[PDB]
Design a protein around this nucleic acid. Structure first.
Ligand SMILES: CC(/C=C/C(C)=C/[C@@H]1Cc2nc(cs2)CC[C@@H](N)CC(=O)O[C@@H](C)C/C(C)=C/C=C\C(=O)O1)=C\CN(C)C
Ligand SMILES: Nc1ncnc2c1ncn2[C@@H]1O[C@H](COP(=O)(O)OP(=O)(O)NP(=O)(O)O)[C@@H](O)[C@H]1O
Ligand SMILES: [Mg+2]
Length: 378
RNA sequence: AGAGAGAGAG
């Protein structure tokens, strides 16, 4: 089970070079437990706290099984969002820089002809895309499941929810029977575990209790607002505290993201907006300016709630509370990346305080009011 | 379930 370091995993001398070149030194908790089962060909259900290195878990696992001499698609990874797919693609190529393993992003909003040309020319060893463009190319027979022996679902609970389930099944129907299935997500509701019995041959169940998901490095607070109409002013009074680093402001609707943005712009406050109705060129720019520190504050929807990794981010503001119990975990997970110190602030009204109790009792975590010395905790 | 949030091409 346990492994001391990457060297003790029987990885190629060229793979261990790309791992340490990326910045790693010692495998995280889950990495020591799941990287070997995944390479051994077992169906794995890996659950771990946020920011613990689940992306590199399967990325290392995939890169080991890839018979680089075979120039065909051998692994398929699916993400609920495009931004996450692009992020996952870079992590794979990074860990396999000295290997020559080709990893292609098969996401929406990209140039179709360019992708069709790249696939017909060369077959990437690893596909990391979203269900839409992935199932499209499979239908056009530009992607071949013939040699796909590994099928990974990041944020599995979201990928197996009401909206994505039928999409995953349309893709799964085109895969072989012997295809290995790997599931990863910080959350794994019981209802989602009931459907894994439908398409997984008794996998390795690495699960975690809900009372232990709350990270210790993420401090959770709340602010009494009473009425919705005062949330704006409260956010502005926090502005100079937000710009202390990089902050993510979560809003439950696209329409409200644009409303708040135009309201803060009208007050001479630098904030960026991000949601799914924007053109893919806008989303790529906005996300670029955010990672490069150009923009410090970002007002977004649940699009960026899951998996988005920005180490510079150390503050998460919940302008609205999530309508999904599990989504709260992923939201706060954007700060305090891998042991770092992170802060989460929940703007709660009176009618919303009812909801906050459920979160505390569900995950067994107390969320105390914010002090004035919080600028030093960021 | 839907809504919300996401999730091909055009
Ligand atoms: C991003 C977005 C919208 C994304 C969609 C809509 C992404 C979808 C996801 C999937 N659904 C399914 C699988 S995969 C299940 C239904 C499936 N049977 C559809 C089908 O096979 O029809 C054929 C005929 C056409 C075809 C091969 C489609 C391939 C992919 C596809 O349908 O993409 C909208 C943005 N808003 C702002 C407008
Ligand atoms: N062995 C390692 N040592 C140190 N840092 C690491 C290691 N592996 C990964 N990381 C970093 O830790 C962070 C974790 O990111 P990620 O792999 O996305 O975890 P995650 O669990 O998938 N996040 P989430 O989707 O919200 O659960 C990233 O900044 C990685 O670069
Ligand atoms: Mg992740």
């Amino acid at each position: 089970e346990i492994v001391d370091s990457f060297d003790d995993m029987n990885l190629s001398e060229s793979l261990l070079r790309g791992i340490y070149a990326y910045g790693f030194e010692k495998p995280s908790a889950i990495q020591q437990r799941a990287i070997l089962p995944c390479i051994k060909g077992y169906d794995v259900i890996a659950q771990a706290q946020s920011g613990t290195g689940k992306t590199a878990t399967f990325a290392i696992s995939i890169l080991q099984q890839i018979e680089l001499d075979l120039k065909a698609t051998q692994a398929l990874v699916l993400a609920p969002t495009r931004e996450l797919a692009q992020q996952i693609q870079k992590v794979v190529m990074a860990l396999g820089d000295y290997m020559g393993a080709s990893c292609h992003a098969c996401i929406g909003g990209t140039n179709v002809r360019a992708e069709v040309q790249k696939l017909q020319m060369e077959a990437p060893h690893i596909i990391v895309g979203t269900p839409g463009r992935v199932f499209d190319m499979l239908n056009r027979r530009y992607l071949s499941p013939k040699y796909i022996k590994m099928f990974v679902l990041d944020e599995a609970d979201e990928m197996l929810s009401r909206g994505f389930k039928d999409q995953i099944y349309d893709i799964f129907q085109k895969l072989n029977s012997n295809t290995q299935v790997v599931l990863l997500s910080a959350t794994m509701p019981s209802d989602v575990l009931e459907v894994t019995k439908k398409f997984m041959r008794d996998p390795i169940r690495i699960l975690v209790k809900k009372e232990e998901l709350t990270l210790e490095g993420i401090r959770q607070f709340y602010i009494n607002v009473e009425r919705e109409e005062w949330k704006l002013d409260t956010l502005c009074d926090l502005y100079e505290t937000l710009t202390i680093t990089q902050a993510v402001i979560f809003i439950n609707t696209r329409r409200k993201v644009d409303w708040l943005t135009e309201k803060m712009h009208a007050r001479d406050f630098t904030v960026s907006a991000m949601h799914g109705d924007m053109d893919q060129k806008e989303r790529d720019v906005i996300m670029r300016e955010f990672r490069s520190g150009s923009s410090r504050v970002l007002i977004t929807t649940d699009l960026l709630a899951r998996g988005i990794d920005v180490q510079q981010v150390s503050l998460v503001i919940n302008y609205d509370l999530p309508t999904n119990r599990e989504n709260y975990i992923h939201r706060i997970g954007r700060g305090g990346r891998f042991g770092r110190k992170g802060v989460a602030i929940n703007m709660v009204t009176e009618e919303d305080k009812r909801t906050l109790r459920d979160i505390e009792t569900f995950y067994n975590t107390s969320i105390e009011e914010m002090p004035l010395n919080v600028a030093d905790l960021i």
